[PDB]
Amino acid sequence: RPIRLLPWLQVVKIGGRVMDRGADAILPLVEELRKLLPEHRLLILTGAGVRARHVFSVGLDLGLPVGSLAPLAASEAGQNGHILAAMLASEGVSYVEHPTVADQLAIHLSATRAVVGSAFPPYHHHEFPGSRIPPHRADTGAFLLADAFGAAGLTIVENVDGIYTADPNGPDRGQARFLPETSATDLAKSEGPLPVDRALLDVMATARHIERVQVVNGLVPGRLTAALRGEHVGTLIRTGVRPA
Amino acid sequence: RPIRLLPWLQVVKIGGRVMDRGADAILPLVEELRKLLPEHRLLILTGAGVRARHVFSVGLDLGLPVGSLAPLAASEAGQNGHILAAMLASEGVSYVEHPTVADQLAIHLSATRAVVGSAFPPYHHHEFPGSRIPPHRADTGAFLLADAFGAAGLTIVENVDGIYTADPNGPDRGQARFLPETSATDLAKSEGPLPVDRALLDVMATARHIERVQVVNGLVPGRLTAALRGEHVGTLIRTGVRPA
Amino acid sequence: RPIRLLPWLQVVKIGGRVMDRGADAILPLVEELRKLLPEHRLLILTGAGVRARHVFSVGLDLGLPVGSLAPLAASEAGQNGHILAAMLASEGVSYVEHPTVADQLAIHLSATRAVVGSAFPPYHHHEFPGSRIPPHRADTGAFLLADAFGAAGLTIVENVDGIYTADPNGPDRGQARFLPETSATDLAKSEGPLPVDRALLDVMATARHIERVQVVNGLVPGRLTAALRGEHVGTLIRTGVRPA
Amino acid sequence: NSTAELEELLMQRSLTDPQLQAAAAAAADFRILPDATVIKIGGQSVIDRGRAAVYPLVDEIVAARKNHKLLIGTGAGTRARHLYSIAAGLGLPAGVLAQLGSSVADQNAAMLGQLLAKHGIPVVGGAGLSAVPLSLAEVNAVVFSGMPPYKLWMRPAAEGVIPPYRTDAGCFLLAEQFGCKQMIFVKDEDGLYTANPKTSKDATFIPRISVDEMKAKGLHDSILEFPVLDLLQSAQHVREVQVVNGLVPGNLTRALAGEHVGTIITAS
Amino acid sequence: NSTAELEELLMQRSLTDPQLQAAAAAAADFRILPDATVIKIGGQSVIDRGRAAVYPLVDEIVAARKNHKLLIGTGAGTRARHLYSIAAGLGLPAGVLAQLGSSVADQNAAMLGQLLAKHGIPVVGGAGLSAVPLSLAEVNAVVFSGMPPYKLWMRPAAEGVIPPYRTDAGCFLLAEQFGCKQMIFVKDEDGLYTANPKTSKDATFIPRISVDEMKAKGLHDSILEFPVLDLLQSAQHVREVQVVNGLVPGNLTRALAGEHVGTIITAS
Amino acid sequence: NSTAELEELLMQRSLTDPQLQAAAAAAADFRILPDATVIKIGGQSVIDRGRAAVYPLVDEIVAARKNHKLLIGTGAGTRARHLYSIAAGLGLPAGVLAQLGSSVADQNAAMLGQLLAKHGIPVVGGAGLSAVPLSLAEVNAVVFSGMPPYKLWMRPAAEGVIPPYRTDAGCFLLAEQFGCKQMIFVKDEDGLYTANPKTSKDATFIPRISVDEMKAKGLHDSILEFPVLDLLQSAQHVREVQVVNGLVPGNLTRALAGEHVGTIITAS
Ligand SMILES: Nc1ncnc2c1ncn2[C@@H]1O[C@H](COP(=O)(O)OP(=O)(O)OP(=O)(O)O)[C@@H](O)[C@H]1O
Ligand SMILES: Nc1ncnc2c1ncn2[C@@H]1O[C@H](COP(=O)(O)OP(=O)(O)OP(=O)(O)O)[C@@H](O)[C@H]1O
Ligand SMILES: Nc1ncnc2c1ncn2[C@@H]1O[C@H](COP(=O)(O)OP(=O)(O)OP(=O)(O)O)[C@@H](O)[C@H]1O
Ligand code: MOO
Numbered sequence A, B, C: 001r002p003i004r005l006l007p008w009l010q011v012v013k014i015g016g017r018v019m020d021r022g023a024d025a026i027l028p029l030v031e032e033l034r035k036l037l038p039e040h041r042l043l044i045l046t047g048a049g050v051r052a053r054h055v056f057s058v059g060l061d062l063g064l065p066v067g068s069l070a071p072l073a074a075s076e077a078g079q080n081g082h083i084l085a086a087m088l089a090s091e092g093v094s095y096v097e098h099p100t101v102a103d104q105l106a107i108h109l110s111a112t113r114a115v116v117g118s119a120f121p122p123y124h125h126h127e128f129p130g131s132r133i134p135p136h137r138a139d140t141g142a143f144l145l146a147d148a149f150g151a152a153g154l155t156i157v158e159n160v161d162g163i164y165t166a167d168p169n170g171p172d173r174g175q176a177r178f179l180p181e182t183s184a185t186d187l188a189k190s191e192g193p194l195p196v197d198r199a200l201l202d203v204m205a206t207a208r209h210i211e212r213v214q215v216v217n218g219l220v221p222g223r224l225t226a227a228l229r230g231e232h233v234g235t236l237i238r239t240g241v242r243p244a
Numbered sequence D, E, F: 001n002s003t004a005e006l007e008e009l010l011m012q013r014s015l016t017d018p019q020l021q022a023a024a025a026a027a028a029d030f031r032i033l034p035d036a037t038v039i040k041i042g043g044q045s046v047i048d049r050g051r052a053a054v055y056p057l058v059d060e061i062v063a064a065r066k067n068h069k070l071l072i073g074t075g076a077g078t079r080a081r082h083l084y085s086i087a088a089g090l091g092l093p094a095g096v097l098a099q100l101g102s103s104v105a106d107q108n109a110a111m112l113g114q115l116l117a118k119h120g121i122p123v124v125g126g127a128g129l130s131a132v133p134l135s136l137a138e139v140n141a142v143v144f145s146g147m148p149p150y151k152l153w154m155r156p157a158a159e160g161v162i163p164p165y166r167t168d169a170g171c172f173l174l175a176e177q178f179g180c181k182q183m184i185f186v187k188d189e190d191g192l193y194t195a196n197p198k199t200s201k202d203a204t205f206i207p208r209i210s211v212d213e214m215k216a217k218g219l220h221d222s223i224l225e226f227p228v229l230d231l232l233q234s235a236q237h238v239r240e241v242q243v244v245n246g247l248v249p250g251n252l253t254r255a256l257a258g259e260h261v262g263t264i265i266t267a268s
């Protein structure tokens, strides 16, 4: 297998719907991240959220193709990153652009303890066709980076406890059962909504380093801290990469 | 009031006419700044000086509007910043561009003790109309940054002791009386020249954090050091922001 | 003479033909560089190698001028830099672009122990006419930077022991005699191939700070470490700059 | 007033000196793009409404550029209001909110430009300096984002952290800087009324009014950003603006033909 | 399916919801550049061969743009293969190799653009959005680099570290995104054969074939990158591609005229 | 000399090898923009003088582009001399001064471009590659800044820290690189004299002279930067230059028409 570029790196993806809740959710998350800075070397990546749904509504009404909608949704993830980095600026944290993440993450994490970036990958008008909704979104971009770096782990911070058998906020909440652990292949052959991109399960099948990814509830203080120490507080997704 | 982004930051504006005096004035200032690096976290911003007056003379003769003259004068402030940063390069100081100042100052001040930038704000062709001379110049840009960051202070380094009742180098030097302290509102209702932009008094009226700004003579070694410790060695300008 | 911008800096140029040998040569060099990071503040610059020869073959067949071939060859030197920086990323080393090297090297070397860049100078379509082969190549660009910074030294890492009286891999290997020491003026009045750019000897004649440059064999572990401590393990080239 | 006396004042006095300011005011006045018209397509009022509103305006733009040179700026809209609400709730200052709003206006310019690309009209980052497309009869128009470049240097309002200079001000300052002959704001109402027509049933239409008359009647902050009315009173080249309803078929075409649709607001 | 029901699903459901995905599939379909043709000039197959191959194709391009709008992408070639071999021997991942390959395609685009500059055809970084040169009869063509923008975010193949999406995929995705009418791959063989024509003496020429028929006969990875055949089956706008021999004089000109030179590969 | 023998030398020898250098010298010679003319507008000699000098030259440029393709570079002038004096007094090296001078040439290009924008002529950062405006009869000209890109990599002079390669050298190297047919320097004197005409009263006008004859008479450093005369002797495409007085009405127009105004300086 290829070498690990940054084996000491920890990657954390913050869901856009978490940022959408405003200060009631962002302020406790910021204080938890502040206490984590002396413990880990962190790359924090933000998702898009509800604003990408509105630009999808306008863009689809205008008939624009999927390669047009992909950078429009990525813009909302970058704005969430600027907001989060501004709240952590007094701790030495700043937002960094994609080419900086791709080529100069090592020097930027030597200068400070953590940086913030956009979780969307730069596919832009080269997005894959098939669906009118861009497939390679925030979860997929965060995992591609973490596995390419050979990072120590990737944690996904959502607004629910984890993955259920059905949408716990949808029409069939009554039959929604929590899944403490699952494999990417088991999820991929299932039909129904998920809290993660379906393209995430595809890039997990070709991964080289990351063996597991945990999805935790960011609205419960302490669960992100516990997940970064390997404690089981959410849904564990096994990628299929085998350990030594 | 809004939160303070970088509450531990100290901002220093170096007048362009100070840089115009050459090594006789720059060399003592560089040695004073060298000794201040271990004491403060500094953002050093440079003004334009006499070269902006020449480009104004050419541009006005060609009839160009005020939005054309604003970036032309800002260029001379950036060149003064490159000169000052080169003299401090052996101490780890470099010039940083405006988008870096706006979005990544926290990480750059985590890597080194001080950085240099242009004091002019990036208004460019969107400069306000009214006067044929660009109103938002070096003093105004430095204060807008310092107040937006919620910095610990802003000090203006000039080639005179402070603000007088008249131009101490003009036609009426005999009646020029030094003002040790004044308010922005008192200065704004006065007529006559000042060593600071008149637009500075306007942005002081809407400020959220900075309570006072001192103007000191950079040609006297030790006065910048004293001003950064709160000692009264020049003209104190009260902004109107009330303390807690 | 002008002041020294970065007097504590050490510059190392890695030949493109060394990188062309692949992991058999790059892996031992990477481990030697890893052990040198705590000892020096390093700017590592990479050359072009055999890929620039192929783009020369295509470009000359198309009839393109020398100013067209210069940026095409510089691209291959930048790719060698990205490869070398990726191998050192876990130590905090990253590739930095030319404008960053020119204006912000001081802050980047305050954040980390070493950075990698392209050794080619940014002459591009403004390359000098005369020869159909670009004259200002990797050796010339590395020396121009090192002398402009006033760096503590410049070491050239090649795939041979040093400079011989003839090409030790060419048609006349039998008469090739090793030269432990030489002057730039003596080399400039000689005819025949050299392992360094002939333009390097010209910029050495107008140098202000660098007094000597050593060419060492990077395929022998330990010689780069010894050269950075001033030990005579290759060919010493005296520039003509006189000591105090 | 002479060139030699202005140069001496420029070298010996502070730029704040009233004698210097008066001498600079007598300089010649060059218009950079005097034959162009600046148009602002509303974000919330037009682009947020989708196909029913944007497609007819694209048709008008393509038809109008045959006889009129156009600089087309875009507004932000509801996505910027969502960003403002999140950031204001966190206590972030106006300078931070200004950068967030620019991204939404960039989104809308990209969507409009992709509908116009097959007609040759590009999206530009420097509209008043995009000399080639504005000079070709085959193009004769460009699309740009309407937010000002102030970013963290944005001047805050007297109260609150909402940026006071947004897409209305950004488009107007372009028209003023380049000496354009016309500035048209494209919104979703017929024009200026005595009250908000969406929340009041007896508002009376106002065909023409000056900035001073608007203030004396409480209309300072209505159809247009209140800071842009003060910029209008200080302008050198653009001394009046026009506000038209973009949801009415052909309204932009008729305004470009000199018809007095909508409301005309004069500086004096 | 209605706009109001799609908007509600877009706000209340996950983007992974099958009900949301089905409603989005019923949206209208806008083609951004429907009159353009995307052409890929091979790196190893054409540009690496020098004057004998490039000069006749430059002549065809200049003659073809009088009647056909063209987007001309470039391949990488042997210099990218050398970079891949060095980086793969060091154990570097596919994301790192993707950036190395883009630089070689940039080199080839720069060399081609300098031969076309005196004819007015520019090198662009945004071909589908370069609206002005594609709209002028005096230009009517642009040159771009064919590598996708994925960089470190490149999806790796099932085995090995060679990037699976290279210049063939980058050029095809442009044609699909902007709704172009034609996609032509310019290589150094007459078309698709039953076996590799360079290493087999009894290969039979195939004038026309579908993607499914190619897979059932072991031809998945031959004249075209095997990932681009899967992208073709999922495409919305470009449902077939053509592969022609660029070393034959006039082959590109005749393909643009509708002649069935080379091999036509259909999605279904 | 053959292609196969050149390729073998390119792979097996150092680029310093005389046998390789001789084989590369026999390669074909392609001119990128053979129909264009490069013109340098002096900074201190023209633009610093203001309206009386710039406005008539703008009129000549607009009239000349109807029949002549132009690349217009700008000089720096007195503001760069002020920056050089400050930085040299601090002991800064030539590489640092080179970056300071480029900003002044950028200022002058921006001022000239805003006077030409309404005529369709743009300011570019890549003039020889700005293929579209140079190909349109409606434009046929571009404006660029004349400083070379060397920055910190600037080769210093034998003595002093003033950059030896400034706007004269930057404009000439453009003309040479792109194979232009003509290079015209626009200054404030009728041409080359036997002595400095500003400080000597008996200087004799020289209509035509070679570089070797200039050196044998102490005229190496006069109307043109002395390093540009050495570049002229090594040039492949531009073997002579012309220096004209831009303060004389119509001098640039007559020089473009083939009239022998000013001084012609030949490489041999
Ligand atoms: N099987 C499932 N298990 C858990 N949650 C589900 C499932 N199916 C749907 N959901 C819904 O998905 C929601 C999370 O939405 P989503 O993942 O789109 O937001 P996000 O990840 O924060 O945004 P972004 O992807 O832009 O960062 C949850 O609130 C939940 O209601
Ligand atoms: N009331 C006043 N009090 C003090 N100085 C004044 C007053 N009015 C005018 N001046 C003059 O203003 C001069 C300072 O000029 P100015 O503020 O333009 O330069 P600067 O601030 O260094 O340049 P920049 O604003 O480009 O940084 C002083 O030397 C003084 O002569
Ligand atoms: N007089 C000489 N002494 C030593 N080596 C010579 C001499 N003349 C020619 N050479 C040859 O030059 C070769 C080095 O080639 P070169 O300097 O072009 O590569 P490089 O410096 O690694 O590449 P780059 O300049 O792109 O970084 C040596 O292997 C040697 O065979
Ligand atoms: O984006 Mo940066 O590269 O903090 O030095």
Ligand code: MOO
Binding pocket: B096, B097, B100, B104, B108, C104, C107, C108
């Ligand atoms: O400008 Mo930088 O972003 O020193 O890392």
Ligand code: MOO
Binding pocket: A104, A107, A108, C096, C097, C100, C104, C108
């Ligand atoms: O390129 Mo950077 O400027 O590491 O902060």
Ligand SMILES: [Mg+2]
Binding pocket: A015, A158, A195, A196, A197
């Ligand atoms: Mg999710």
Ligand SMILES: [Mg+2]
Binding pocket: B015, B158, B195, B196, B197
């Ligand atoms: Mg002042």
Ligand SMILES: [Mg+2]
Binding pocket: C015, C158, C195, C196, C197
């Ligand atoms: Mg060598």
